[PDB]
């Protein structure tokens, strides 16, 4: 139905489950088309409106809110950073969502924040680290390691310094969950690709890392070296 942002904003609060999903789908469609305008009364009103969707129990609508935020990030760029502190904590929680597509759109929102320069890659990863390394949900801990990997692969050591990340990633080698232990391994391997052999003595000083895992990690690095 709605023809502009103000129209979406007005109809969001009242809307019943029925039209709520259609509204979500159309909102995303609207924001995706760069021939559509994001003129409205107050952008904060749209942000506030998306919040119950994002923090909600319907995951289709949550996912669309993430997609909606991605579109605002793309249009707003650094201007979006006014809303980062409000949105980020719930996007983090969605990294742990049971539905694979929800985690995807959440990870994509995170990449969009960096690609569209809402904040520098180091700023975002550091901020995530605060909430993610010790999150109660193993899927968040695992997803966050992947966020680090993707950010490194996309931006390289020019914008992302992972030296200070080695000890917390190493701590995850002893995670109570096997999926995380294995993710932590692969993350160090991915970091090796960027950082090179200086990582080896770095890990050797990590009295955390058992010799058996140091050895296993070194085998994996050697294997990478055979490019």
Swiss-Prot record:
Q: Say which species the protein is native to.
A: Drosophila melanogaster
Q: Where in the cell is it found?
A: Cytoplasm, Cytoskeleton; Nucleus; Cytoplasm, Cytoskeleton, Microtubule organizing center, Centrosome; Cytoplasm, Cytoskeleton, Spindle
Q: In which tissues is it expressed?
A: Expressed in testis and ovary.
Q: Which domain of life is it from?
A: Eukaryota
Q: Between which residues do disulfide bridges form?
A: none
- Parent-protein residues present: 5 to 229 of 1491
Placement of HEAT repeats on the sequence: 40-78, 81-119, 159-197
Q: Which family does it belong to?
A: Belongs to the CLASP family.
Binding partners and assembly: Interacts with CLIP-190 and microtubules.
What the protein does?
A: Microtubule plus-end tracking protein that promotes the stabilization of dynamic microtubules. Required for several aspects of mitotic spindle formation including the formation of the overlapping central spindle microtubules and kinetochore attachment. Required for the incorporation of tubulin subunits at the plus ends of kinetochore microtubules during poleward microtubule flux. Acts antagonistically to Klp10A and Klp67A to maintain metaphase spindle length. Also required for guidance of CNS axons downstream of Abl.
What is the protein name stated in its UniProt record?
A: CLIP-associating protein
């Amino acid at each position: 139905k709605p023809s502009d942002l103000d129209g979406f904003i007005q109809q969001m609060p009242k809307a019943d489950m029925r039209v709520k999903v259609q509204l979500a789908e159309d909102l995303v469609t609207f924001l995706s088309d760069d021939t559509n305008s994001i003129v409205c009364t107050d952008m904060g009103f749209l942000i506030d409106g998306l919040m119950p969707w994002l923090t909600g129990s319907h995951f289709k609508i949550a996912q669309k809110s993430l997609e909606a935020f991605s579109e605002l990030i793309k249009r707003l760029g650094s201007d979006f950073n006014a809303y980062t502190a409000t949105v980020l904590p719930h996007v983090i929680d969605r990294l742990g969502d049971s539905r694979d597509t929800v985690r995807e759109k959440a990870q994509l929102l995170l990449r969009d924040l960096m690609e569209h320069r809402v904040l520098p890659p180091q700023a975002l990863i550091d901020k995530l680290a605060t909430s993610c390394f010790k999150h109660k949900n193993a899927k968040v801990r695992e997803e966050f390691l992947q966020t680090i990997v993707n950010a490194l692969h996309e931006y390289g050591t020019q914008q992302l310094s992972v030296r200070v990340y080695i000890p917390p990633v190493c701590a995850l080698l002893g995670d109570p969950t096997v999926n995380v232990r294995e993710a932590a391994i692969q993350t160090l391997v991915e970091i090796y690709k960027h950082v090179g052999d200086r990582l080896r003595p770095d890990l050797r000083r990590m009295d955390d890392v058992p010799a058996s895992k140091l050895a296993m990690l070194e085998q994996k690095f050697d294997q990478v070296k055979l490019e």
